[PDB]
Amino acid sequence: EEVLLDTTGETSEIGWLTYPPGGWDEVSVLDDQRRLTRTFEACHVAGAPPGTGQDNWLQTHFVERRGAQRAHIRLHFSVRACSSLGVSGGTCRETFTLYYRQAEEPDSPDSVSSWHLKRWTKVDTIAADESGAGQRAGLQLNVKERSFGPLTQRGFYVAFQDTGACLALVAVRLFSYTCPAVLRSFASFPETQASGAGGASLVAAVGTCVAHAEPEESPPRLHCNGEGKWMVAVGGCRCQPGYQPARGDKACQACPRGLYKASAGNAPCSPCPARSHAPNPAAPVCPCLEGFYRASSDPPEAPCTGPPSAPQELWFEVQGSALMLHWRLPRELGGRGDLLFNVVCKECEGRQEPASGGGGTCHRCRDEVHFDPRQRGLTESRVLVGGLRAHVPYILEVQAVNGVSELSPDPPQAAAINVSTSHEVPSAV
Numbered sequence: 362e363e364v365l366l367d368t369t370g371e372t373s374e375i376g377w378l379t380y381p382p383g384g385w386d387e388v389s390v391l392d393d394q395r396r397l398t399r400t401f402e403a404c405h406v407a408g409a410p411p412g413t414g415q416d417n418w419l420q421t422h423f424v425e426r427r428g429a430q431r432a433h434i435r436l437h438f439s440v441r442a443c444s445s446l447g448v449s450g451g452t453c454r455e456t457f458t459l460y461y462r463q464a465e466e467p468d469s470p471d472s473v474s475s476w477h478l479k480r481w482t483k484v485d486t487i488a489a490d491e492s493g494a495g496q497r498a499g500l501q502l503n504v505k506e507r508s509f510g511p512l513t514q515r516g517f518y519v520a521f522q523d524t525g526a527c528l529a530l531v532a533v534r535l536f537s538y539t540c541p542a543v544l545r546s547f548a549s550f551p552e553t554q555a556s557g558a559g560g561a562s563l564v565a566a567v568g569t570c571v572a573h574a575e576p577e578e579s580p581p582r583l584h585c586n587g588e589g590k591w592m593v594a595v596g597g598c599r600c601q602p603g604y605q606p607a608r609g610d611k612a613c614q615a616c617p618r619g620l621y622k623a624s625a626g627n628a629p630c631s632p633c634p635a636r637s638h639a640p641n642p643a644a645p646v647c648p649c650l651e652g653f654y655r656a657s658s659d660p661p662e663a664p665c666t667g668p669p670s671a672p673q674e675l676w677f678e679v680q681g682s683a684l685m686l687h688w689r690l691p692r693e694l695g696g697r698g699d700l701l702f703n704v705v706c707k708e709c710e711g712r713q714e715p716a717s718g719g720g721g722t723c724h725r726c727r728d729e730v731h732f733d734p735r736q737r738g739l740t741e742s743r744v745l746v747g748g749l750r751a752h753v754p755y756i757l758e759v760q761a762v763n764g765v766s767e768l769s770p771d772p773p774q775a776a777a778i779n780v781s782t783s784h785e786v787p788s789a790v
C-alpha cells in the first residue's frame with residue numbers, strides 16, 4: 362500500500378477549489394480524538410424551493426502519480442437524509458458522483474487553471490449505507506472505496522460532484538497497492554506496482570536467483586495481485602552443489618564440514634561416505650583419505666575403496682601336458698569385489714659354470730605357453746599353464762588388482778612360487 366494523498370496528515374496538504382464559488386464550503390472541526398480536521402460541505406438543497414438545480418464541484422490539488430498504475434480512493438463522509446429537510450420533493454438526492462482526470466503537468470499557472478471545462482472521467486456515483494450538515498461523532502461516518510483505470514501520465518486530479526445532496530466530505534485517502542519485494546522459491550522478486558487495469562488482472566514479475574542458486578531447467582517468475590499479494594508462481598531457482606536450502610525456499614547455505622551435496626537442488630547435505638572427509642564447508646564431494654580412491658563407476662556418494670593385498674596360498678598340480686596354478690583370495694580386498702588376477706611367467710636360468718652370485722637369467726616366458734582361460738584378467742583363483750618345458754625351471758607370479766589401482770599404483774601387490782615340472786626315483790628306506 363503506497364499513499365498518494367492523505368487528509369489525516371501534515372494538517373491536510375490542501376490547495377483545493379470549488380467550481381461554482383461557494384459550491385463547496387470548507388468548515389474545520391475537532392474529530393472524535395483531539396485533532397484538527399479540514400472538511401468540505403455542500404448543502405445547498407435547503408435554498409430556493411425549486412432548487413434552481415445543483416451542480417457544485419470540488420477539485421483536489423494535482424496529485425503526483427508517482428508510479429501507481431491503478432489508484433484506489435477511500436472516502437469518509439456524512440450525508441443528511443432528505444426526509445429531514447425542508448419540503449424538497451424531487452430535487453433532493455442522497456448521493457454524489459466522483460471523477461478523475463489526468464495531467465502531465467499541474468494545471469497551467471493562473472492562465473488555464475479554471476478547470477471544470479476539462480474532460481472529467483466518471484468513476485462511480487456513491488451512496489451512503491443508511492440505517493445543515495455536520496459530523497456529530499455518532500458514527501454517521503460512511504466509508505466507501507472505489508478505483509480508477511490505468512494511470513499513465515505524471516499525475517491526476519480528483520473531483521467531487523454534488524447534485525442535490527446535503528454532504529460533508531471528512532477524509533480522503535488516495536493510494537495504490539504494491540506487492541512487497543520478497544524471497545520466494547529461492548529467488549528474489551522486486552517490489553511491484555500496478556494492478557493496472559483492475560481487479561482480476563495480474564502484473565508479472567521476474568526473479569533473480571539468490572546466493573548460490575541456479576535456474577531449474579524455468580527462469581523464475583511471480584505474479585502481483587490487484588491488492589498487493591503474490592499470486593501463484595512459475596519457475597524458481599534451486600540451490601547449487603555444496604549448498605543446501607536454509608530459512609526455507611529463501612536462501613542457500615553452504616554444507617557444514619563433513620557434509621556434502623553432489624548435485625542439483627533443493628535437497629539437504631548428507632554426511633560423507635566411508636573413507637572420505639569433507640574438511641571444509643560447501644563440499645560438492647568428500648575426497649578420499651590418503652590411500653583410498655573412487656573408481657570410474659563410483660558416484661560421489663560411494664564410499665572410497667582401496668587396492669587389494671597379495672594372493673595367498675599358491676600351489677600347483679600337473680594334468681597331462683600342462684600344469685594348473687592355484688591360489689586363494691587376498692587377505693585385504695579394499696572393500697570392493699571387482700578383484701581380478703594377472704599371472705606373469707619367467708623362465709629362470711642359473712647356477713652353472715658362470716654367475717655364482719645370483720646368476721639366474723630370468724627372462725619372461727616365450728610365446729608358446731598359452732594359459733588356458735587368459736593369463737591376464739582372471740576372476741578365478743586358478744589358471745592352467747600351457748606349453749612349459751621339461752626341466753627348465755619357471756617362476757610364476759600372481760598379481761591382484763581391482764577397480765581402483767588405475768588410481769595409484771604403487772606396483773600391484775603380488776605373490777610368486779618356484780615351480781619345477783617332473784619327478785622321479787621312488788622312495789626307498
Ligand SMILES: *[C@@H]1O[C@H](CO)[C@@H](O[C@@H]2O[C@H](CO)[C@@H](O)[C@H](O)[C@H]2NC(C)=O)[C@H](O)[C@H]1NC(C)=O
Nearest residue numbers: 711712717718719720721756776777778779780
Ligand atoms: C625361488 O628359488 C630361488 C633360487 O633357488 C630362491 O633364491 C634365493 O633366496 C635366498 C634366500 O631365501 C637368497 O639367499 C638367494 O640369494 C636367492 N637366490 C638368488 C639366485 O638370488 C628364491 O628365494 C625362491 N623364491 C620363491 C618365491 O620360491
